[PDB]
Structures are given as structure tokens and as C-alpha cells.
Design a binder for this molecule. Structure first.
Ligand SMILES: Nc1ccn([C@H]2C[C@H](O)[C@@H](COP(=O)(O)OP(=O)(O)OP(=O)(O)O)O2)c(=O)n1
Ligand SMILES: [Mg+2]
Ligand SMILES: [Mg+2]
Length: 380
DNA sequence: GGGGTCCT
DNA sequence: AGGACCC
């Protein structure tokens, strides 16, 4: 009974970079974070570059590959919010998934448009983009009609994103979030597809690995494989009783429904972010003098972002990762420090973070850190 | 990697 | 505070 759209930008970081430096939009491009090419444009994907590939492999598999540094997410994050604000203008319930994916619940919009339709141009209702599995449309099936109106709205969304933000992307229209996300990637890049209900099982069985189901991640998949469960059909067919006692009642029941293409989870309004964090990874930090400097660097960056936002963070968290898996310490922020917008907030904040740091790290005995992160949360 | 979410 | 998920 729902019409959901999943919007997925084409090679997002690379797209932002190509727009920033149009001298790049004609060469194979890779966006680099440390030793990783986290994403690349479709010209590089032709030359055999894949997501999250090593720069050694990349530089060898494509020596003409242009690399730009994408460790600072500032510009990506800003464009990311322009996209979801644009979608929110179509319909206010927009759920973000990472920086480059959004779900919108179109069912009220679709119903409104259909109520405005007369007899002449309901003939007449046509699909925009691809129909998954090339299945024939039945114009007398109200479910088909509602999903086709969905595809028209999705086309308007992609058109607005291009005309207003210069961005291309894909869309998937289906009856729930799981299916919309699975179907959006069927034709890429810069294309869209709609899933009609009688093709649901074809879509779910098209998957080759159980980890390809959104909601089934690394740990869960490893567990399932441990159990002899490898195909979607294996999971569909496994004993609920055993699954429940192996993974617990909540996860087992949820993921088994997913394996049938069933997902009743609502599209949630993401709204403003609930946390701001910054991190830096490194080979080695083994002193407190370094720690403090790193933390000060991160803290400075964060205060720029708190300042921009408006709301104020009421707790701080320090996160670490030691050599050879993360640990954290948090505490409320003193009320007087919370009012800064002018003064000197650095020293009192670094004082707090260093205490947390010494709480976790025993500095009287040697240590080896490989990541540091500062997070502001509990915003008001 | 450099983010972000929610539940236990 | 830690674990699991998503990108
Ligand atoms: N461990 C990971 C996995 C993902 N990413 C980033 C790179 C991508 O920009 C985005 C997730 O990748 P997508 O699946 O959205 O793929 P892209 O948007 O990069 O390209 P496309 O959608 O065309 O496949 O988040 C990341 O930072 N770290
Ligand atoms: Mg994308
Ligand atoms: Mg998965």
C-alpha cells in the first residue's frame, strides 16, 4: 500500500569534485582517503577500478587515474544536505542513508495526484524510466497505477536535482524501503527503475550473497554462513526456531522477513543531524603531546560546525582505536562552557577531552593509538 | 576511510 | 559503553 522512492547519487564524491574542477570531468577520477580510493567516476569503473580499492592496485590497474583528496568531507556534506532539502520540498518525510542516499514516502503525494486525475488522461498513465524485469503494466491494477505515478515523481526529483544542483543520480520506486533500495541500482548510472509487485521474488532471488540484503551486515552474514545459509532462498527456508535462538528473536524475525522482500519499516524524518564528529587515522600516536595536538585539531574543526549549526551540544565523546575495536568515553559539557558563541572555549574543552583521554589511556605505561575522534552529541 | 544511525 | 547497521 506504500509508494517509496530511494534516490542514489552517481559516484557522489567524484561528482562533487568534477563539478568543482570541470577540468576533471573528462578523465578517469578517483577520490582518495589515505591509501584508499573510496569512489571513482564511471570512466574509471570502465578501466577496472572498483569502490574502496587500494591506491597501489588503482595506480597499477589505471596509471592514468587522477586522484583527488577527499579526507575532508565538508563539501560533500554540504552538497548532501542541499540534496535532501530539495527532496523535502517534494515531500517532508525524507530519510537520509549516509551522504548520498535518501528515501521518500510518496504515498500521500501519489494519492493526491490520482484524485486530481479525470477519465481522459488516466488512459494514459505512463511509466517514467525502466520497469524491472521488463514486466508488462496492467493499467487496471491500482497498485501498478500508484507505482507509475511514483516513477513520474521520481523523474521530477531527478530533473530538479540536475537543474538546481547539477547532480545526476538513480531512483528506485517500490512498495517498501528494502525493495526501493534494491531496485534503484538495477540500471546505472543516471537512470531509474520501478518494481511492480509480481516481480518481487525475481528481484530478491537475483541477489547472489545474503550480505547483499540491506540490514544483513558483516557479523550477521558470517553467522549465517556458519549455519550453512548462503543464498537468499536458504535464508527463506531456514528454521525460524533455530534462527531465533542463534541470532535472537528480534534479528532473526527481521532478517527472515527481509529475505522474502518484506520490510514494514517506516520512512523516518531524518531532520538535522543528532551528532557532529571528526576523526583522523594514523599509523602511530604514542605520546600525550601528540594526542593533545590531534585532539585540538579535531576540536577546532568541530567548533566551526557547531557554530554554523545553531543548536548547542550537551555532551562530548572521545573515541580511540589502539594498535592491533574502538573504545569511547563521554561526559556532559559544563553549562558555562556550553555558552561560547566570542570567548575561549578551546582550553576548557581540551581540558575535558584530555581527562577522558587519560581515563581510557594509561599514560604512565606505553601505548599505540591508530585513530582519534571527537564527537559532539545530545544537541539542543 | 570518514562519517552517521539505532538498540541493548 | 559497546555493538550492530548503513554509506
Ligand atoms: N566503507 C565505506 C563505504 C562507503 N563509503 C562512501 C563512498 C561512497 O561515496 C558512499 C557509499 O558508496 P555508494 O554505494 O553510494 O556508491 P557511490 O555513490 O560512490 O557510487 P554509485 O552510487 O554510482 O555506485 O560512501 C565510505 O566512505 N566508506
Ligand atoms: Mg551513489
Ligand atoms: Mg547488507
Amino acid at each position: 500500500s506504500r509508494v517509496i522512492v530511494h534516490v542514489d547519487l552517481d559516484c557522489f564524491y567524484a561528482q562533487v569534485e568534477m563539478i568543482s574542477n570541470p577540468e576533471l570531468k573528462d578523465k578517469p577520477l578517483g577520490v582518495q582517503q589515505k591509501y584508499l580510493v573510496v569512489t571513482c567516476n564511471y570512466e574509471a569503473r570502465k578501466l577496472g577500478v572498483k569502490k574502496l580499492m587500494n591506491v597501489r592496485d588503482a595506480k597499477e590497474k589505471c596509471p592514468q587515474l587522477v586522484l583527488v583528496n577527499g579526507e575532508d568531507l565538508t563539501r560533500y556534506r554540504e552538497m548532501s544536505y542541499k540534496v535532501t532539502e530539495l527532496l523535502e520540498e517534494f515531500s517532508p518525510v525524507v530519510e537520509r542513508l549516509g551522504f548520498d542516499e535518501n528515501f521518500v514516502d510518496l504515498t500521500e503525494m501519489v494519492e493526491k495526484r490520482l484524485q486530481q486525475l479525470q477519465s481522459d488522461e488516466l488512459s494514459a498513465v505512463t511509466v517514467s524510466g525502466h520497469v524491472y524485469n521488463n514486466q508488462s503494466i496492467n493499467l487496471l491494477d491500482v497498485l501498478h497505477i500508484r507505482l507509475l505515478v511514483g516513477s513520474q515523481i521520481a523523474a521530477e526529483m531527478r530533473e530538479a536535482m540536475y537543474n538546481q544542483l547539477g547532480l545526476t543520480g538513480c531512483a528506485g520506486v517500490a512498495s517498501n524501503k528494502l525493495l526501493a533500495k534494491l531496485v534503484s541500482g538495477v540500471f546505472k548510472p543516471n537512470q531509474q527503475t520501478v518494481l511492480l509487485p509480481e516481480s518481487c521474488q525475481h528481484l530478491i532471488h537475483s541477489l547472489n550473497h545474503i550480505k547483499e540484503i540491506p540490514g544483513i551486515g558483516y557479523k550477521t552474514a558470517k553467522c549465517l554462513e556458519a549455519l550453512g545459509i548462503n543464498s537468499v532462498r536458504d535464508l527463506q527456508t531456514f528454521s525460524p526456531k533455530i534462527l531465533e535462538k542463534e541470532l535472537g528473536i528480534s534479528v532473526a524475525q527481521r532478517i527472515q522477513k527481509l529475505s522474502f522482500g518484506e520490510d514494514n519499516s517506516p520512512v523516518i524524518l531524518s531532520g538535522p543531524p543528532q551528532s557532529f564528529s571528526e576523526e583522523d587515522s594514523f599509523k602511530k600516536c604514542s605520546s600525550e603531546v601528540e594526542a593533545k595536538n590531534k585532539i585540538e585539531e579535531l576540536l577546532a574543526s568541530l567548533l566551526n560546525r557547531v557554530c554554523q549549526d545553531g543548536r548547542k551540544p550537551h555532551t562530548v565523546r572521545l573515541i580511540i582505536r589502539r594498535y592491533s575495536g574502538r573504545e569511547s568515553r563521554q561526559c556532559p559539557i559544563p553549562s558555562h562552557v556550553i555558552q561560547k558563541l566570542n570567548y575561549d572555549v578551546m582550553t576548557p574543552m581540551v581540558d575535558i577531552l584530555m581527562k577522558l583521554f587519560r581515563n581510557m589511556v594509561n599514560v604512565k605505561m606505553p601505548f599505540h593509538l591508530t585513530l582519534l575522534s571527537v564527537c559532539f552529541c545530545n544537541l539542543k
